[PDB]
Every structure is written in structure tokens, then in C-alpha cells.
Amino acid sequence: KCTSDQDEQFIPKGCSK
Secondary structure, three states, X not given: OXXXXXXXXXXXXXXXX
């Protein structure tokens, strides 16, 4: 998850691309 569960000032190795 992008900006919800794994913080808004961090996106994970899972969201982007």
C-alpha cells in the first residue's frame, strides 16, 4: 500500500512499479 498503511512520508518495495 502506497500512502495509507505503510506511512505517507514512506512508500514500500510493493507500491511503485
